[PDB]
Design a protein around this nucleic acid. Structure first.
Lengths: 610, 572, 398, 330, 45
DNA sequence: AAGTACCTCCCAACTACTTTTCCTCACACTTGTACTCCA
DNA sequence: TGGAGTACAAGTGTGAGGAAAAGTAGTTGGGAGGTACTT
């Protein structure tokens, strides 16, 4: 029995410490600090597949739309077929119609006689309660929620040779009181907006709300979030919301306000673990493993944990693992906004003294946010476990198993159109490009031939000739009319400027022409230090500026050279800004704004104070 | 935020080295069916250096340089706004021992009042002083005396003796009549004390009825509450005044001491007991600094309760808020009452004035604290070793209170006292005079006296100087012969200095008074309590280090050098 | 007592000149740095004053009473933008929308450390304009550009030169492709234009509406790569790009590297939550994160009860408490930009249809949304960017 | 994704949550006259409850005197459509000068439809935008068992101006789990309870933003969770010291008598002190009068918490350990 | 330069006007003045 | 004057709803300019 | 081919909201205590 408690609750939030000490000096660590020692633990998914199938808000009343849990039929009681695993998942246009054997993976059945049963009022609840663990046999029926009524199934008469699962259904009573019923759980037990009820579910398949009941309505529960269970089988119910706990024995008259939590929590699930004593809560940033009292089993508030993240859509599932000295408990909080899980490792003991070990996280498929996840409880330190998946904008039911040791719709319906009117138009435009890709495939080849050659030694001083005369036109273009107070084109040659093949010369001929004007009226700019923003790195020289463009596309270019050559020379006549006048054209424009701009506008144009 | 202040810092600031006084209250109401607990602030009071509560307590000399003090820091004083002050120790009468004073200053009180009397000073276990004088009358009617706040009250003794335990008058009578019928000075003086009271109060027969009258006349000067009946006032008088060594659960045992303060008194007016001299270092003890400081701090939170009630008495002048399960109305009171006990305690340590609206049991209200000067290191160490005889005795120019006395051997230095006006009133302790501070355990010792030849107190019905009354701390428990306690004063000494039972302390003084012709009253007197003077001696058989008070040493033969040890005389 | 107290939210007209005083001194801080590390020459600084001298007249031509000077923090981006498209620089606004998410030049939080004297005399309703309020989102940088070249004639007086040979060439090196794509897009831009060559930028003088023609000169070049990325491997009998090459074509490029441009690309995903896979920060490694946590060490230079937090500095040192990775560790061991090109070309070494058109569509998912983060627009404003490029070429060839 | 340490107000969101809680203020005064007969507009809602001061929720144990019979008056269509007819007739008057989504925000929450839109994830402030991404990264390698990096995220987190009280102290386990050249972690919670050493009363009435009380303020009736953590941090670190007579003196100073556990951890400072010292190397009067004290201390330090409030102990074998410590001496 | 001495942490910090009389490396109150190079003369008797 | 009357002497927890008024665009009205079954 | 009817080129019109620090201001912690009241 534990020593460090309070009685209102029992604390162990994330990663700080615990507050207790048994003090057992018998050579075996005389202290029970909850942050215990173990080896490291990491969960690895096992990718597999199981089966197939407003804008700024998301509703709370949608909870489950798929289920697979070990539930047994009626006819396997005299036969020793010990428990069955059947399927039921929503399908349809908007998901209204409803339709296995664990061999090595988790997959659909082998002779696919699923009954796609027609439901004309759609799906927002696919869930079974199961039964209790100490009764002797399983339950054999499931009641779900439709948008108009309240249906009842029955798991009778499944066989093996055909792998067929049929149900016998009871006719649903509609909303006599037109309020949306929230969650059904058995443990016609319902939760409508306002009230609850208990019903004796029938016992035939061919052909009642009891005469004492009550309400649950709260004005200051702003959501329509509700969820219901029962408490410990002895005529006691639990009705939840985002707000409080409603514990009613319908024979007695006793209402109990334990969880007074409209202040700073938002309850987003309530889950009854299969051991009927320890029942878990996973509301807002809280993880409670509050147990049962042995004197009066009505509630014990036990070991609880905080939940650090700030998500509002956290579902939970909890799978027990019966190991010969401790009892395992986990917590899968999965998001319809993101991918993250957040779990714990508990070890339930006999004398109600139980610890935790740590927290761990796994992620999911990047495309889609998980909308439905259930464990596989398997017939009931190598932390192996498994669970099914279902995601939002992902209707593909995969399988995963945590062992220890995507294109968007805004693309597909637009590109590659079905136009026969313009099928060959772009179809000729892929042969229009090659009509000029290969027009310009052999003019460079004659420059692959002539490398610093004599009939382009013709060109190289003519390249100096026709780029020395047509500079003083633009240096005497604005000498007559310098008073502008109210450019650099450099396309003065017109041959092609593209029939000469030399990297170390044409850079050092333009740079040879820069020093030719060591006088005024022109400002030239450079290339070894201006032009670096393609390479993301230093350029000491233009020989190795081009060489990182030459040691990058060796194989992928056509023979590494011919497309690479007219890359940089193209940029030379694309960075052809070399003909701005000298400093006396900007500065006397800077004084017409400083002086026609009045005495307010001196300090308005003022740098140079720090 | 709350940082750690060191007394190096309070010397620079010239502020007082204060510690904040927590004081939680129990505002209960309506037969205690609602209960309020308010830990409220009461200002900072200064705190002694190297106490528990100073930071320098478990602190290295190496670390006293780390926090800037002398490496051999004395401590044990107050810093009151920079001036280093301390509470002077004073010499008061020994606790819980009925002295046998003679005094000419009783004849001022009226006609027929004698000059003799019995004086006792029963301290409370929380160090509170209380004197219960017991006079003698020529008329025979012995009048008890006490003081409650500032006044002096007189009652007949049998009124107390009827009130202590449920006695018939012959149970009172034969209670005093232990033996010695044939003495005509017992059996005649005792008559008028009984004959007068039957004549003075014929309508007060039993103890339930005598408390109807005793709590009646002392009701309003005790300021008791109207829910308390006249007996419950009178029982509280019997639990607040008379012989407060026990208080409650000792109303049988408080009877047996007033049978001893009369049989002493009748053995004085005949002169079979010579009167004790209070100056003689044998009936006087030390009033320490903190034990004084723990009385005035009790007094100032008695002047704090009565001001909260005085504020509610200022609220009966309105019909403002008769709201006594109200949370905020209590805050409405105490945000108006002077709860500053800060400069009420520091004011005691600044001027020296002992202010009290109630009043202690001491007689002067000044000179309780001085300036610990630092003119060298001899002067500063001798403040802590000084003790003053008492500020009243400067009036009496009879030099008996000023003379060197032989019982100061080893307790008070014969040399070290100043000249001039307080030459004799200002004598210091000795090199080895160590003072008991805590008390000792007495849950084991009476089980040892009964194991020796001591008959218990209730079964015996005997008295007189001719027997030996065994006492512990002013609790009469036994009766033996004079040759019996003459052996017990050797038998308890062997059983003490050896390792027998941890119930026997070593600070315990065994004041066996041997019988003598018309000398001190014979008896075997044990004291183990607070505030005694003790020094180490060497006990000769079973040779260990022994501890001896100034009341044992009046009747021992302690040799000086072992060259000078004689035979059959020196035990120490 | 009022002689000690000043700077009390009361400055009438000088405060309206305070943002006309502070926002050239911080401009002085920005382009002086661009010469220091971004290597732009002396002709990058001399240009950028007369640009600021006729933006004062843009307000001064409006009357003084109720003037409401319309400026933003993107004003010093847009007057830097005029020092780009007139200067014939190979730069593109990827290299300014991302290097403020690395915040290399002092753009974000330009009030905190930059002025050092002109904070305290500010009214607190221009304070949302002087400092780093938000980031420009959904094309907000492309919308102050309409305020920039529009009221004064940046055309006619100067030249609007998106060097259109460059963004094609930049995207060649951004995603490790064979360089035939550099010339494949050449006869695609040159078939949807009247008077084919040398595109110009959209201006604005009358309206208040974002361009539903999407006439931004750079935004049109961005769409021009978006159909020729689809053509060469599905509209292709030539089958030159082979069938085993497809597997390491998309998913190799959709694989996290740690270059100085690709680590700094990740903070655009941090600042902008809008696009999908912007929350892909969970999948980092150690040295991918210590570079990010030493990217903090250039964030924190812009970005008496203080000695208590000095103890918090003292008990948490930023450098490691024993033997950090500064002194006795690697000199040259970082994978470079000329490596993640060449490694993938070493990975896509093979060189010599329904299972193809679906397997090219994976590449349409990556690089046509790799365009999305490198300029920080929305994919629904990608749809305004597409829907005027294909139908008009459908209208122009007929 | 995690619960963020940012103090940031918004125009359009602080309206719409006033516009949320003022919608309670008309649907609860209709229910006053439904469950009975059948100038700031938020502070009335918070005075309707009692603020917890213990944990995230205010609790009560169950089998107690907190009982009342259940209402059996069923709530239906004839009473639910009329609880929200009177607000939307009158609470629509702020809906015509607010923003265009304060209509949008408000109509949706009456009909389920919880927000996908959480406020501080698109806020793009570039300074509270760097905080959000670093907090997911902070817990990341902590939940992946790799302490070289998450230890070095934290120092960069606490140089950004705008971080708050929650992330300061609870995840200081990164010093607790360094351990090779560590800062020892215990001097961290010394300073954290230094400058935050307030004994202020729990104010209980502020409109609580940016914080939560029950982890990080020093209010009365339950002390600071940054205070009692320092004791449990140091005391097992005092058991690892093999400073017991130096640590029980640090409970000696503070007057935390507003609680129960702080005396029980003081009911073991002298328990374990009598573990080594109640052997005395015997196999001899000097520690007998030291052991025999150091159990009677525990005898009215375990009792003094039994005097205090809620702390349930197995009182059979806790005493049997204490009785047997003095049987060591015999 | 005129500076002073923090009595607590021994850190020489100066003091301008309209300032706290405090330390600023620790948080201490009582604060003492240092000396500088100043000519004082003495007889050697 | 005789002990109340009790009114205040009086700062300010963490921000509370204000708060300084500035600034980014949203979201479709207009009738040809286009591409077409009856006439 | 001359005349429609629904899809759609193309100009200018309405109001109406996110930025978040910036300093002031919402109740009870707060901050102390002898001066200020005519029944």
């Amino acid at each position: 029995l534990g020593v460090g408690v309070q009685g209102a609750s029992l604390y162990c939030p994330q990663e700080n410490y615990t507050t207790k000490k048994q003090e057992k000096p018998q050579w075996l660590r005389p202290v029970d600090d909850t942050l215990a020692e173990d080896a490291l633990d990491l969960h690895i998914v096992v990718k597999s597949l199981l089966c197939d199938t407003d804008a700024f808000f998301w509703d709370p009343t949608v909870a489950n739309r798929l289920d697979s849990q070990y539930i047994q039929t009626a006819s396997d009681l005299r036969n020793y077929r010990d428990g069955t695993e059947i399927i039921a998942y929503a399908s349809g246009k908007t998901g209204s119609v409803l339709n296995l054997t664990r061999q090595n993976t988790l997959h659909l059945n082998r002779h696919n006689n699923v009954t796609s049963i027609e439901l004309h009022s759609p799906i927002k609840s696919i869930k079974i309660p199961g039964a209790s663990e100490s009764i002797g046999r399983r339950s054999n029926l499931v009641g779900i929620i439709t948008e108009n009524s309240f249906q009842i199934f029955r798991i009778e008469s499944v066989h093996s040779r055909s792998c067929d699962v049929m149900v016998s259904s009871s006719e649903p009573l509609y909303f006599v009181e037109i309020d949306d019923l929230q969650v059904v759980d058995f443990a016609a037990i319902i939760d409508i907006k306002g009230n609850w009820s208990i019903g004796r579910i029938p016992k035939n398949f061919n052909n009642l709300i009891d005469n004492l009941h009550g309400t649950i309505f709260d004005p200051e529960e702003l959501s329509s979030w509700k969820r219901i269970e029962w408490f410990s089988h002895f005529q006691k119910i639990l009705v939840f919301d985002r707000s409080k706990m409603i514990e009613i024995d319908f024979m007695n008259n006793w209402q109990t306000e334990v969880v007074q939590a409209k202040a700073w929590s938002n309850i987003r699930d309530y889950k009854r673990i299969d051991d009927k004593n320890g029942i878990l809560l996973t509301s807002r940033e809280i993880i409670i493993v509050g147990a049962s009292e042995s004197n009066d089993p009505v509630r014990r508030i036990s070991w609880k944990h905080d939940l650090d993240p700030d998500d509002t859509t956290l579902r939970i599932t909890v799978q027990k693992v019966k190991k010969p000295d401790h009892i395992l408990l986990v917590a899968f909080v999965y998001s319809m906004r993101h991918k993250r899980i957040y779990m714990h490792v508990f070890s339930h003991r006999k004398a109600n003294l139980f610890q935790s070990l740590g927290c761990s996280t796994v992620l999911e498929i990047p495309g889609g946010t998980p909308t439905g996840i259930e464990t596989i409880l398997t017939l009931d330190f190598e932390l192996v476990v498994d669970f099914l998946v279902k995601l939002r904008n992902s209707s593909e039911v995969y399988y995963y198993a945590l062992s220890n040791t995507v294109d968007h719709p805004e693309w597909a319906s637009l590109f590659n159109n079905a136009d026969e009117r313009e099928k060959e138009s772009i179809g000729a435009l892929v042969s229009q490009i090659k009509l000029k890709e290969r027009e310009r495939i052999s003019r460079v080849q004659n420059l692959i031939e002539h490398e610093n050659s004599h009939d382009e030694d013709k060109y190289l001083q003519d390249l100096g000739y026709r780029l020395s005369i047509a500079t003083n036109e633009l240096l005497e273009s604005w000498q007559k009319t310098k008073d502008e107070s109210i450019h650099s084109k450099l396309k003065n040659l017109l041959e092609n400027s593209d029939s000469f093949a030399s990297i170390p010369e044409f850079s050092s001929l333009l740079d040879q022409f820069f020093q030719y004007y060591q006088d005024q009226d022109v400002t030239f700019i450079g290339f070894e230090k201006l032009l670096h923003l393609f390479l993301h790195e230093d350029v000491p020289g233009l020989d190795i500026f081009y060489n990182k463009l030459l040691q990058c596309w060796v194989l992928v270019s056509p023979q590494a050279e011919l497309l690479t050559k007219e890359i940089v020379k193209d940029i030379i006549w694309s960075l052809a800004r070399l003909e701005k006048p000298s400093l006396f054209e900007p500065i006397q424009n800077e004084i017409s704004r400083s002086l026609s701009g009045p005495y307010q506008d001196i300090i308005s144009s003022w740098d140079m104070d720090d | 935020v709350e940082r750690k202040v060191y007394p190096s810092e309070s010397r620079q600031r010239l502020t007082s080295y204060r510690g904040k006084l927590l004081l939680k209250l129990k505002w209960s109401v309506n037969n205690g069916e609602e209960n309020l607990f308010e830990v409220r602030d009461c200002g900072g009071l200064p705190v002694m250096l190297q106490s528990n509560r100073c930071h320098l307590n478990k602190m290295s000399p190496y670390e006293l340089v780390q926090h800037k003090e002398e490496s051999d820091e004395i401590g044990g004083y107050f810093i009151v706004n920079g001036i280093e002050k301390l509470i002077r120790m004073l010499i008061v009468q020994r606790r819980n021992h009925p002295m046998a004073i003679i005094r000419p200053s009783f004849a001022n009180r009226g006609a027929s009042y004698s000059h003799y009397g019995i004086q006792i000073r029963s301290v409370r276990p929380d160090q509170t002083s209380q004197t219960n004088v017991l006079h003698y009358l020529n008329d025979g009617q012995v009048t008890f005396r006490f003081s409650w706040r500032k006044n002096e009250y007189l009652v007949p003794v049998v009124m107390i003796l009827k009130a202590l335990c449920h006695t018939s008058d012959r149970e009172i009578f034969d209670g005093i009549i232990g033996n010695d019928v044939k003495d005509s000075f017992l059996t005649d003086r005792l008559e008028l004390l009984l004959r007068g009271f039957k004549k003075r109060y014929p309508h007060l027969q039993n103890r339930t009825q005598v408390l109807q009258y005793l709590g009646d006349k002392f009701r309003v000067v005790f300021q008791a509450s109207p829910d308390q009946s006249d007996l419950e006032v009178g029982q509280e008088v019997l639990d607040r005044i008379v012989l407060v060594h026990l208080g409650k659960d000792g109303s049988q045992d408080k009877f047996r001491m007033l049978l001893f303060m009369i049989r002493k008194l009748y053995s004085l007016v005949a002169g079979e007991c010579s009167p004790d001299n209070p100056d003689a270092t044998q009936h006087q003890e030390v009033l320490l600094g903190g034990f004084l400081y723990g009385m005035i701090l009790k007094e100032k939170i008695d002047e704090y309760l009565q001001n909260i009630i005085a504020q509610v008495r200022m609220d009966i002048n309105r019909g403002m808020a008769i709201n006594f399960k109200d949370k905020r109305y209590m805050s409405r009171v105490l945000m108006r009452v002077n709860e500053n006990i800060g400069s009420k305690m520091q004011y005691f340590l600044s001027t020296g004035n002992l202010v009290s609206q109630s009043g202690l049991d001491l007689q002067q209200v000044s000179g309780y604290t001085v300036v610990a000067e630092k003119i060298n290191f001899y002067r500063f160490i001798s403040h802590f070793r000084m003790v003053h005889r008492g500020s009243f005795f400067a009036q009496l120019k009879t030099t008996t209170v000023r003379k060197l006395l032989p019982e100061s051997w080893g307790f008070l230095c014969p040399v070290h006292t100043p000249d001039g006006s307080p030459c004799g009133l200002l004598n210091h302790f000795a090199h080895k005079c160590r003072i008991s501070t805590q008390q000792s355990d007495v849950s084991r010792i009476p089980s040892i006296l009964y194991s020796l030849g001591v008959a218990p107190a209730s079964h015996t019905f005997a008295a007189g100087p001719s027997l030996c009354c065994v006492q512990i701390d002013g609790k009469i428990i036994g009766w033996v012969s004079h040759e019996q306690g003459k052996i017990i004063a050797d038998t308890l000494r062997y059983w003490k200095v050896e390792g027998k039972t941890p119930g026997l302390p070593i600070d315990l003084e065994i004041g066996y008074v041997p019988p003598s012709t018309r000398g001190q009253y014979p008896g075997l007197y044990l004291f183990g309590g607070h505030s005694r003077m003790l020094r180490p001696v060497r006990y000769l058989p079973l040779d260990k280090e022994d501890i001896v008070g100034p009341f044992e040493q009046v009747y021992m033969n302690i040799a000086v050098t072992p060259q000078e040890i004689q035979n059959n005389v020196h035990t120490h | 007592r009022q002689s000690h107290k000043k700077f009390k939210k009361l400055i009438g007209h000088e405060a309206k000149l305070l943002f006309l005083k502070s926002f050239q001194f911080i401009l002085k801080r920005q382009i002086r740095w661009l010469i220091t590390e971004m290597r732009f020459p002396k002709e990058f600084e001399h240009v950028a004053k007369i640009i600021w001298l006729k933006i004062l007249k843009t307000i001064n031509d409006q009357p003084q009473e109720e003037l409401k000077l319309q400026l933003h923090m993107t004003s010093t981006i847009s007057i830097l933008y005029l020092a780009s498209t007139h200067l014939s620089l190979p730069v593109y606004t990827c290299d300014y929308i991302k290097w403020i998410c690395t915040a290399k030049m002092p753009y974000f939080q330009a009030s905190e450390i930059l002025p050092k004297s002109w904070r305290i005399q500010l009214p607190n309703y221009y304070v949302s304009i002087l400092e780093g309020s938000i980031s420009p989102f959904n094309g907000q940088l492309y919308n102050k550009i309409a305020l920039t070249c529009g009221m004064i004639h940046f055309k006619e007086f100067f030249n609007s030169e998106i060097s259109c040979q460059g963004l094609l060439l930049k995207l060649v090196m951004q995603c490790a492709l064979p360089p035939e794509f550099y010339f494949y897009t050449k006869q695609v831009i040159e078939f949807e234009e009247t008077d084919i060559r040398n595109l110009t930028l959209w201006e604005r003088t009358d309206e208040r509406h974002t361009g539903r023609v999407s006439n931004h000169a750079e935004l049109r070049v961005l769409s021009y790569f978006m159909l020729t990325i689809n053509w060469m491997l599905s509209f292709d009998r030539d089958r030159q790009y082979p069938l085993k090459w497809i597997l390491s074509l998309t998913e190799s490029l959709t694989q996290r590297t740690t270059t100085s441009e690709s680590i700094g690309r990740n903070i655009v995903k941090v600042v902008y939550p809008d696009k999908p896979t912007s929350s892909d920060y969970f999948q980092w490694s150690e040295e991918e994160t210590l570079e990010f946590l030493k990217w903090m060490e250039k964030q924190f230079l812009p970005t008496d009860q203080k000695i208590a937090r000095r103890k918090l500095y003292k008990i948490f040192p930023l450098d490691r408490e024993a033997n950090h990775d500064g002194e006795f560790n690697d000199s040259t061991h970082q994978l470079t930009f000329i490596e993640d090109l060449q490694e993938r070309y070493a990975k896509q070494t093979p060189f010599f249809p329904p299972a193809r058109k679906e397997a090219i569509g994976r590449l349409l998912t990556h690089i046509a949304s790799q365009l999305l983060v490198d300029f920080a627009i929305s994919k629904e404003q990608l749809k305004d960017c597409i829907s005027r490029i294909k139908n008009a070429c459908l209208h122009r060839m007929n | 994704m995690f619960e963020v340490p940012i103090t940031l107000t918004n125009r359009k969101f602080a309206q719409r949550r006033k516009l949320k809680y003022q919608y309670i203020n008309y649907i609860s005064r209709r229910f006053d006259r439904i469950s009975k007969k059948s100038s700031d507009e938020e502070r009335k809602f918070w005075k309707k409850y009692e603020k917890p001061e213990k944990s995230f929720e205010i609790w009560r144990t169950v089998s107690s005197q907190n009982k009342q019979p259940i209402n059996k008056q069923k709530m239906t269509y004839h009473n639910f459509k009329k609880i929200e007819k009177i607000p939307l007739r009158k609470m629509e008057i702020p809906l015509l000068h607010c923003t265009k989504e304060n209509k949008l925000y408000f109509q949706s929450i009456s009909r389920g439809l919880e927000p996908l839109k959480t406020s501080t994830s698109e806020v793009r402030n570039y300074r509270t935008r760097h905080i959000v991404t670093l907090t997911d990264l902070l817990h990341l390698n902590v939940s992946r068992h790799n302490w070289s990096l998450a230890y070095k995220i934290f120092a960069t987190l606490i140089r950004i101006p705008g971080v708050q009280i929650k992330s300061l102290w609870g995840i200081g386990v990164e010093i607790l789990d360094n351990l090779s050249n560590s800062s020892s972690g215990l001097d961290f919670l010394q300073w954290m309870c230094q400058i935050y050493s307030s004994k202020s009363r729990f104010v209980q009435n502020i409109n609580y933003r940016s914080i939560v009380p029950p982890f990080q303020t020093g209010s009365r009736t339950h002390t600071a969770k940054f205070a009692i953590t320092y004791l449990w941090s140091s005391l097992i670190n005092c058991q690892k010291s093999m400073l017991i007579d130096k640590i029980s003196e640090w409970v000696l100073t503070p007057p935390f008598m507003e609680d129960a556990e702080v005396w029980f951890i003081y009911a073991s400072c002298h328990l374990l002190k009598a573990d080594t010292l109640s052997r005395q190397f015997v196999n001899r009067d000097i520690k007998i009068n030291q052991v025999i004290k150091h159990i009677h201390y525990v005898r009215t330090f375990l009792k003094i918490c039994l005097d205090k409030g809620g702390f349930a102990v197995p009182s059979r074998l806790i005493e049997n350990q204490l009785k047997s410590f003095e049987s060591r001496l015999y | 330069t005129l500076k002073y001495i923090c009595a607590e942490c021994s850190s020489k910090l100066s003091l301008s006007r309209t300032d706290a009389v405090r330390c600023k490396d620790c948080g201490h109150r009582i604060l003492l003045k240092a000396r500088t190079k100043r000519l004082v003369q003495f007889e050697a008797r």
